[PDB]
């Protein structure tokens, strides 16, 4: 977790080492409870001693409300009062060991203790490697959602104003200017962002601690014996729920301006305003404007930091800007101002579907309509480009919809007869739809996705709103006929027929379940929507989407969220995407299966019996396919217990290519830090290793009809 016993008021995450860990052992082995009762018993094993403290740090608060006192030379007692700073007092020695702990670092420490406690209590999955054998501190971007590097002015000494701000009063409180500026940056940044973030870390890049014997104090090349740092980096854990809130709520209005209102007006200055809302409340509030290139946080940190710390500072986070730009910008009104967390484009598509959803039911048919289930990509907030009215060059323009009529015994028992009855339904649906509702346009098309099943015909409905929907029948007899299909086939042909059945259930049966779960889970994971398109965009640039079914990319892209350990749930596009690339880089799909609990953050969680069943499937498959030539990625969940549904038919070269690019991408990030040049290098294709390359150009440009 990147925790050390070193100073943290300077800016580095740390202060908590063995000694603070081991000293806390003894305090709890001598008590620790609110009743001075022993929390740890001296007969405990190594596991039990470690568990209680990971539990202790997780739930008892030692900084704001509550503090612990012990006796080195007397049972340790947990006091409810707190000193507003991390404190483990020792009455025998009158020292607080937790003085080196910063307020900001303590909550980050408490978060790691709690989330490990959840894995420690976990029984379904083994968590030994994640808790101990995985370094989360290698990359700041992977560990932290947003990073802003601030270049202080005149950096062979800080400007007279900044040196003046430190002033005599703060040497006594804060011995070094590096310590003081970090506290200044934390307080203004914490206060400015407020609820928009969970945790904030301020780090002094290029701070040295060792100097030659010939010299009295450490010398920084920029410092000039004045300031031991090159620059500061503001690292954040953003809160997706309220990160993109347009307004920062403040204290309410009153006859006499309150102290909270006083600090509120002074801090934001002209940016502050008193504004009223529909509910009738009058409160002091400030305004921000959303952008498709940057989050609201970049605007707040820039304005807040310039006003208070230094007007000459330079705030820049270009890395996050590039990823936002790489996401396609739709051709809708006010697209640039729209935030990347807004799903309004998808919602307008659903409302248009709802209008057609009503027309179809009131229509009279020989069989009553059981249900209409939209299964298209845009319905699950995953389409690479957001839906655009009349932008029919988008390949995702026609959204799949499954129509199922009421069960009847009059279905043809011959599958080619079965579908020609299915098409006869859609034919009638087309006829009265054309008559009653002429504003809707429609046409039929053939589907050949199911191998050998050449009679499938689908109705493409062009809604007046400017959206396309594609309709196909589902029939209860259809499934068993395929089960009949495998049984009668010759033993040599049975493996081929089951493949036909596999893609049938992938499109008809399991497709419904995939959209239902993903749509619901996507609400909790606000940043799943943006990241999955950018991952699919990355696949397209390297020519991998053609062999990779869209579902497989989705199940891969959701792994960092349902299983974020040892990391936290991403709240940024750059953080979420790189985590997907990291997982692929370290994924051993030959020996390690990929299984997910598509559930909201803490039922439908995989318990032990269902869990063991899935590995048993993996071992049996790998027993027959040890090299993994036939199957490479084993992706399973509650929806897909077989684990081969969405990862079958991919050539081995594409599977290794997917992992090959990920490792080189991670190695690229290792050799050269995240920057503009690297990001372009990630998202551009080599096209050289391919044996032969063919260049095509379409007669007309397809961007404007694609909604980009």
């Amino acid at each position: 977790r990147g925790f050390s016993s070193n100073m943290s008021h300077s800016g580095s995450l740390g202060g908590f080492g063995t000694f603070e860990f081991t000293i806390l052992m003894a305090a709890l082995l001598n008590g620790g409870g609110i009743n001075s009762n022993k929390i740890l018993l001296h007969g405990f094993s190594s596991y039990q001693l470690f568990k209680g403290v990971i539990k202790y740090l997780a739930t008892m608060d030692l900084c704001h409300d509550g503090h612990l006192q012990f006796h080195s030379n007397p049972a340790s007692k947990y006091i409810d009062e707190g000193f507003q700073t991390p404190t483990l007092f020792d009455k025998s020695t009158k020292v607080n060991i937790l003085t080196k702990m910063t307020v900001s670092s303590y909550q980050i420490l408490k978060e790691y203790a709690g989330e490990t406690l959840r894995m420690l209590n976990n029984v379904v999955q083994d968590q030994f490697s994640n808790i101990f054998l995985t370094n989360i501190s290698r990359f700041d971007n992977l560990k932290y959602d947003l990073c802003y590097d601030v270049q202080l002015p005149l950096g062979n000494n800080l400007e007279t104003s900044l040196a003046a701000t430190f002033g005599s009063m703060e040497r006594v409180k804060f011995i070094t200017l590096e310590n003081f500026l970090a506290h200044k940056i934390t307080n203004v940044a914490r206060y400015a962002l407020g609820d928009r973030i969970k945790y904030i870390q301020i780090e002094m890049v290029g701070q040295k601690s060792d100097f030659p014997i010939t010299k009295r104090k450490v010398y920084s090349n920029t410092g000039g014996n004045h300031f031991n740092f090159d620059f500061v980096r503001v690292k954040l854990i953003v809160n997706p729920s309220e990160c993109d809130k347009l307004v920062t709520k403040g204290p309410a209005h009153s006859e006499t301006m309150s102290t909270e209102a006083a600090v509120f007006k002074n801090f934001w200055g002209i940016k502050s305003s008193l504004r009223r809302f529909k509910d009738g409340s009058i409160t002091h509030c400030c305004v921000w404007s959303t952008s498709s290139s940057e989050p609201i946080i970049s605007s707040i940190v820039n304005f807040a930091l310039q006003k208070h710390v230094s007007k000459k500072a330079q705030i820049s986070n270009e890395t996050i800007k590039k990823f936002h730009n790489f996401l396609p910008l739709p051709n809708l009104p006010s697209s640039a101002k729209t935030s990347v967390l807004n799903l309004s484009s998808f919602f307008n598509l659903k409302k248009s579907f709802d209008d057609l959803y009503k027309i179809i039911f009131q229509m009279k048919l020989p069989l009553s309509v059981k249900s209409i289930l939209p299964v298209g990509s845009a319905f699950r907030y995953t389409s690479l480009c957001q839906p655009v009215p009349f932008a029919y060059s988008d390949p995702d323009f026609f959204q799949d919809v499954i129509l199922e009529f009421e069960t009847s015994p009059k279905w043809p028992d011959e599958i080619t007869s079965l579908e020609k009855a299915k098409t006869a339904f859609l034919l009638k649906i087309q006829e009265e739809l054309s008559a009653n509702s002429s504003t809707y346009r429609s046409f039929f098309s053939r589907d050949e996705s199911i191998p050998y099943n050449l009679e499938i015909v689908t109705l493409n409905i062009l809604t007046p709103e400017g959206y396309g929907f594609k309709f196909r029948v589902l029939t209860e007899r259809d499934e068993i006929l395929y089960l009949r299909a495998i049984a009668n086939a010759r033993n040599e042909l049975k493996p081929e027929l089951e493949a036909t059945f596999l893609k049938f259930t992938a499109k008809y049966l399991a497709s419904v379940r995939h959209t239902r779960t993903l749509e619901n889970i996507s609400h909790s994971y606000q940043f799943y929507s943006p990241v999955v398109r950018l991952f699919k965009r990355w696949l397209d640039t390297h020519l991998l989407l053609g062999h990779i079914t869209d579902e497989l990319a989705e199940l891969i892209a959701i792994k960092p969220f349902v299983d974020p350990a040892p990391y936290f749930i991403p709240g940024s596009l750059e953080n979420g995407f790189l985590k997907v690339l990291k997982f692929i880089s370290q994924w051993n799909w030959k020996d390690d299966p990929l299984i997910l609990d598509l559930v909201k953050p803490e039922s439908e969680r995989l318990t032990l019996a269902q869990y063991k069943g899935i590995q048993m499937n993996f071992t049996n498959l790998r027993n027959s396919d040890p090299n993994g030539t036939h199957l490479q990625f084993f992706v399973a969940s509650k929806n897909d217990p077989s684990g081969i549904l969405y990862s079958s038919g991919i050539p081995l070269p594409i599977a290794t290519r997917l992992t090959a690019l990920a490792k080189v991408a991670v190695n690229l990030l290792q050799t050269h830090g995240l920057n503009q040049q690297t990001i372009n290098l990630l998202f551009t294709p080599g096209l050289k290793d391919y044996d032969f390359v063919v260049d095509l150009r379409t007669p007309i440009g397809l961007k404007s009809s694609c909604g980009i």
Binding site: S45, S46, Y47, D126, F128, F132, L133
Partner: peptide
Amino acid sequence: SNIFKLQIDELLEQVKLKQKHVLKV
């Protein structure tokens, strides 16, 4: 639990310092 206990013991012996480098210091 037994799996976790053995995993601890394997982890320890990997990271135990070599006693020869102790005697050197």
